[PDB]
């Protein structure tokens, strides 16, 4: 299927949240829970390396498909995840299969071209949308959206617009809002009457 | 001979400092010595006492030549050194010879153009270089460095640069490092293979 990336996939109607998104840590589950289809943010300065928290979320989860995307991190993060996921394995209804068969990766290190990152995020949301139409639950975690913000600042500054706030463009807010808006638990459009859901875990870098 | 200012005349080699800078005051010598050809920083405050070191260095010192520079000063120190021509004479031969023969003066008021204040500090190093080429030992009194920084800030304001830090331009530290690079014991191109040295004493007014 050939599909444009910037266009929302049509749906039938929207639906609230009813089921809890599983969280491995005792904290953030019994104190600050998240719903299977909602939106979460994890701003945190350097040093903490919250990427490992993202790894813990991807590793164990009651969802069906997990999609990880990268925005300007290091290839070493890829190195851990690609080395580890083939080792890890789990079963649901019988035979045991590696969790690599139920995950997709979109690597993008910082050495890559600047403008490619915006594209990468948009392709990520597109892939998760297609699997939303499949009638499943897909939890995605996007890493270092601040790199996307910087790339947008840079393309604008080179194109010589007038900076609005902190040097960043005048339309970062609407773009981020639209990017996060592609989410939620909805009812698919089909005779087999599927039921899809998608959640986002965006990571912020102060 | 004519020699441009914003560079350093090449030298054959730099040798490590291997002789103490003599000072008449016993304090600052047997406790916190300064090596001949080194770099020093002295604070500057209204009334704390700066002539106490300048006069002692001019009269009692193993140095061969004295050069005093500065910007935004008064004529009072000028008349003081005029009176110190006979009074602070050194009796190397048992007789009164004026420090004028052993020293050169240059000063600027705040009426002078901004670039004059900016460039007098470079000019001091140029003169010291000319005399260290002869095979002699020089001492520099780089008075009122904060005034030089303010002059550079004014120049940048004239040229419409960005206020990198506290109004001061971006390249202040780099210029200071380049300025303090010109020191130490060296030996220059020639037949007799003489040797010399240059020391710097920059006053700072926090």
């Amino acid at each position: 299927q050939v599909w444009p990336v910037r266009q929302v996939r049509p749906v039938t109607e929207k639906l609230p949240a009813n089921h809890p998104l599983l969280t491995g840590q005792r904290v953030l589950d019994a104190l600050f829970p998240c719903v299977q289809g909602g939106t979460t943010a994890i701003p945190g300065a350097f040093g903490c390396g919250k990427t490992v928290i993202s790894q813990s979320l991807s590793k164990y989860s009651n969802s069906d498909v997990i999609i990880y995307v990268g925005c300007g991190e290091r290839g070493n993060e890829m190195s851990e995840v690609l080395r580890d996921f083939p080792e890890l394995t789990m079963e649901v209804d019988g035979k045991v299969e590696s969790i690599m068969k139920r995950t997709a990766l979109v690597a993008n290190t910082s050495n890559m071209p600047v403008a490619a990152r915006e594209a990468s995020i948009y392709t990520g949301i597109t892939l998760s949308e297609y699997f939303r139409d499949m009638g499943y639950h897909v939890s995605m975690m996007a890493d270092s959206t601040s790199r996307w913000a910087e790339a947008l600042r840079e393309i604008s500054g080179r194109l010589a617009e007038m900076p609005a706030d902190s040097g960043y463009p005048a339309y970062l807010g609407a773009r981020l809002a639209s990017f996060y808006e592609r989410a939620g638990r909805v009812k698919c459009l089909g005779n087999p009457e599927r039921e899809g859901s998608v959640s986002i875990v965006g990571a912020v870098s102060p | 001979q004519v020699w441009p200012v914003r560079q350093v005349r090449p030298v054959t080699e730099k040798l490590p400092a291997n002789h103490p800078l003599l000072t008449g005051q016993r304090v600052l010598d047997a406790l916190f010595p300064c090596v001949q050809g080194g770099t020093t920083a002295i604070p500057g405050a209204f009334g704390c006492g700066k002539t106490v070191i300048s006069q002692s260095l001019s009269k009692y010192s193993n140095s061969d030549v004295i050069i005093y520079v500065g910007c935004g000063e008064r004529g009072n120190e000028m008349s003081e050194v005029l009176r110190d021509f006979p009074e602070l004479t050194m009796e190397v031969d048992g007789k009164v010879e004026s420090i004028m023969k052993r020293t050169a003066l240059v000063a600027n008021t705040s009426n002078m153009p901004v670039a004059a204040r900016e460039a007098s500090i470079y000019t001091g190093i140029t003169l010291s270089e000319y005399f260290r080429d002869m095979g002699y030992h020089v001492s520099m009194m780089a008075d009122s460095t904060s005034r030089w920084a303010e002059a550079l800030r004014e120049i940048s304001g004239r040229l419409a640069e960005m206020p990198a830090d506290s109004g001061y331009p971006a390249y202040l530290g780099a210029r200071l490092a380049s300025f303090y690079e010109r020191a130490g014991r060296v030996k220059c191109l020639g037949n007799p293979e003489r040797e010399g040295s240059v020391s710097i004493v920059g006053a700072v007014s926090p």
Binding site: P163, S166, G167 | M162, P163, S166
Partner: protein
């Protein structure tokens, strides 16, 4: 009388010394750190303008 007043004086002096220690070594650093932050933010905003 002398020693009773002595022990009462000891109680008073230790508590007040503790108080001045606390205020001096606690309150001030936060204050000047916030001064540094506020001046930095003001300068950044001005440079952006």
């Amino acid at each position: 009388s002398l020693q009773t007043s002595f022990v009462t004086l000891d109680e008073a002096i230790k508590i007040t010394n503790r108080r001045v220690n606390a205020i001096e070594h606690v309150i001030i650093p936060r204050i000047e750190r916030t001064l540094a932050y506020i001046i930095t933010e003001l300068d950044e905003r001005e440079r952006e303008e």
